[PDB]
């Protein structure tokens, strides 16, 4: 059970490159005569349930860990017993003060922190 994906590239919206009012978020083309919706050659792909990844590998980072979002230092403690499968993602608005409290606690706990070097700076 290794982290293997059925596709890397994202699904862009059709004609989203030409226009700027058209967003790159995938929108299903409902055009009645839309040949790109009709799956012609030289067109783009389209999301299907056939593109799902392994259910024992869904949500898994390329190193095998599933990201887990820890707000405060209480959250980093409950990953005590899943440190081999989950990685303590630090929320984006957590201040540099509690950010060190989260990383030092998680280092001793044995869990892996994904963004442990943000807004902080080491000193020897």
């Amino acid at each position: 059970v290794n982290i293997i994906k059925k596709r890397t590239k994202p699904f862009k919206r059709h004609q989203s490159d030409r226009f700027k009012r058209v967003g790159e978020s995938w929108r299903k083309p409902r055009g009645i005569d839309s040949c790109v919706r009709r799956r012609f050659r030289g067109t783009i792909s389209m999301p299907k349930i056939g593109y799902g990844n392994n259910k024992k590998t869904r949500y898994c980072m390329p190193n095998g860990l599933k990201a887990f979002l820890v707000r405060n230092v209480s959250d980093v403690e409950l990953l005590l017993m899943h440190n081999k499968t989950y990685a303590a993602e630090i929320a984006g608005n957590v201040s540099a003060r509690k950010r060190v409290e989260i990383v030092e606690k998680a280092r001793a706990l044995g869990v892996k922190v994904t963004n442990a070097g943000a807004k902080v700076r080491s000193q020897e």
Binding site: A96, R99, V103, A108, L109, V120, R121, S122, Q123, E124
Partner: peptide, 18 residues
Amino acid sequence: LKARRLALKHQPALIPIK
């Protein structure tokens, strides 16, 4: 155990950025 060994080693401080 891990809390003990980390204390032994002179690990670097993490001075934040303002």
